Amino acid sequence: CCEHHKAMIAGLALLRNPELLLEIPLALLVVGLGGGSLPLFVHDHFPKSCIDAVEIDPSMLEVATQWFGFSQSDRMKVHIADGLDYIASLAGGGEARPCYDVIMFDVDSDPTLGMSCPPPAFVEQSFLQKVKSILTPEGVFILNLVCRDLGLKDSVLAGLKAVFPLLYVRRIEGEVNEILFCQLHPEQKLATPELLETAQALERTLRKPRGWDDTYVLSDML
16 A cells, blocks of 8 residues: 555565466565555455454554554454564464465564664564574565664675575665565575566566455355
């Protein structure tokens, strides 16, 4: 919906054939709910997506559920937790631990900190190792970054690249935010023409206007 959300969703083009993308299950972890529009968009446009959303503030979930059309279902669950704690627990799950195709950080907090979007702990290298441990090998880690301190920004970017050696960057028109798209295997990266092709294919489907709501039919039938 908003410009930085459209850019984050665009990162799904780094996964695989965008024809296939709608037609196959996709596991997505999203940290930071806001008004719910980002996970709601994915839920509504990708009928086989399974989303875990982590949100620190129960009031954000309350308002989104009461007034902004957000809801939980079998395919979209919200956990009230600090994303740092939540990812640390998931990463400690053993061979049982989850494996997400996509991890999105849309987290924005404390004015004290040297950056608030995300808080710096989310991009510290020992935490980034926990993120890597719950991502599929060919998955994508997508980060909304606001960092006006350019010295800090270079340190953040260097640390990200140390753990995710394939980095792409999108600056957003009319705002300071940039979206980082982080992957694990630079040798498998798409050539520029392929990069262009996959993006255009994704946007064609998401603009296409459709469907049937199959939820909660049993009450009416019985």
